[PDB]
Design a protein around this ligand. Structure first.
Ligand SMILES: *[C@@H]1O[C@H](CO[C@@H]2O[C@@H](C)[C@@H](O)[C@@H](O)[C@@H]2O)[C@@H](O[C@@H]2O[C@H](CO)[C@@H](O)[C@H](O)[C@H]2NC(C)=O)[C@H](O)[C@H]1NC(C)=O
Ligand SMILES: *[C@@H]1O[C@H](CO)[C@@H](O)[C@H](O)[C@H]1NC(C)=O
Lengths: 274, 9, 99
């Protein structure tokens, strides 16, 4: 199937408390693999996945230097945006960026992306064509004009189609035992009473990877996505994920409801009952 | 691997 | 763009007294990013807690995981306490072993 390399970058100013906090977190698919945090003593790029032990010391030195340079670029951007938006220097503001590429099973590029946000709202983003930008407001339009004059899209496109894709292929090769594995979900149902003649049935799916999964509740063969309650799929601390979905049913009629679990590690979907 | 030498905002 | 965090507490494996497990506190859908997250055992802060899986959703809200290894006991209680500007007082969410 397809695979992705994504970097989540955050710069947060803190007036009166020194320099902004700067963080970079990288993921290959749903697995965290590298991280940089300016608030750590002796800030350096660090491995977050076991297979990254395969890179030499040169890799860490180069990524650390790049991170420090990027940190400084965002310090300047925070000041620049205060000007664009005519805001005071006493408040905290945030810049967020998501950067990355996706490749198919054959390793060829499927899509690239680079999106920025300021204080939690869209700022500017590279369009799917990897040639033009989409600006959310007049401040971002200033940035758009600067980037067009500097040829930023061409520079970024070269990174997305070249460097990004080539390194993603390498990470998938080196971490194959971890990244190309499939951990099948193990499920079970819990039961809880309610004040009125009804009960809550909760279906749990545990220990699976990758993260994509589908949990549904059925009645007479009809899906109850409309009356279903659930949580977003979440990490469980060891590289696997979990999720649950619940429905409220009449007491004494719990046997008519079934939970269905669909996942890459389930040749045939699971069907559970209380 | 991370990108670098980006154009400022 | 103030968004109040959703706090979820859960273990990696169904709880079984005496057997090693992992306790998780996933704090999601919040903004601004400044936040304080603490895991507690019987009301006392747990020392070695790992922070991981930091990311943002499509609407730019923040997500982050706090986790630690632990061996459940019949008497021990666990919780996650979070402090964020969207809330007046810190919020404590307890681990519900029977959920
Ligand atoms: C995962 O891939 C390895 C092959 O190693 C990869 O390529 C290396 C050059 C280096 O980049 C490693 O870090 C990569 O992981 C598979 O190992 C081979 O397994 C076959 C039989 O299964 C064996 O004949 C070869 O000798 C092994 N290669 C060596 C010498 O290490 C491994 O099986 C893969 N794991 C799975 C199944 O996902
Ligand atoms: C910036 O804010 C000041 C004070 O609110 C105001 O006087 C000034 O006109 C603003 N600048 C702009 C964007 O016009």
């Amino acid at each position: 199937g397809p695979h992705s390399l994504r970097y989540f970058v955050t710069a947060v100013s803190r007036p009166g408390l020194g320099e902004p906090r700067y963080m970079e977190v990288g993921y290959v698919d749903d697995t965290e693999f590298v991280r940089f945090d300016s608030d750590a003593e002796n800030p350096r790029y660090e491995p977050r996945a076991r297979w990254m032990e395969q890179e030499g010391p040169e890799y860490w030195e180069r990524e650390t230097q790049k991170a420090k340079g990027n940190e400084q670029s965002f310090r300047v951007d925070l000041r620049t945006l205060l000007g664009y938006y005519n805001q005071s220097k006493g408040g905290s503001h945030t810049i967020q960026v998501i950067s990355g590429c996706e490749v198919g099973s054959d390793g060829r590029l499927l899509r690239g992306y680079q999106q920025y946000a300021y204080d939690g709202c869209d700022y500017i983003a590279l369009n799917e064509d990897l040639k033009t930008w989409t600006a959310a407001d007049m401040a971002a339009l200033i940035t758009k004009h600067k980037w067009e004059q500097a040829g930023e899209a061409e520079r970024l496109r070269a990174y997305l189609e070249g460097t990004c894709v080539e390194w993603l292929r390498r990470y998938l090769k080196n971490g194959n035992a971890t990244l190309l594995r499939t951990d099948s979900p193990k499920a079970h149902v819990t039961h809880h009473s309610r004040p009125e003649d009804k009960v809550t049935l909760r279906c749990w799916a545990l220990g699976f990877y990758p993260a994509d999964i589908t949990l549904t509740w059925q009645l007479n063969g009809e899906e109850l996505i409309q009356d279903m309650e659930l949580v977003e799929t979440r990490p469980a601390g060891d590289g696997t994920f979990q999720k649950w979905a619940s429905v409220v049913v009449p007491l004494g009629k719990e046997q008519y409801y079934t939970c269905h679990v669909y996942h890459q590690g389930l040749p045939e979907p699971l069907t559970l009952r209380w | 691997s991370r990108d670098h030498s980006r154009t400022p905002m | 763009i103030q968004k109040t965090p959703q706090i979820q507490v859960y273990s990696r494996h169904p709880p079984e007294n005496g057997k090693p497990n992992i306790l998780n506190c996933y704090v999601t859908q919040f903004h601004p990013p400044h936040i304080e997250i603490q895991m507690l055992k019987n009301g006392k802060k747990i020392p070695k807690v790992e922070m991981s899986d930091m990311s943002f959703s499509k609407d730019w809200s923040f997500y982050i995981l706090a986790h630690t290894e632990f061996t459940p006991t019949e008497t021990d209680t666990y919780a996650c306490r979070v402090k964020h500007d969207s809330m007046a007082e810190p919020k404590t969410v307890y681990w519900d072993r029977d959920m």
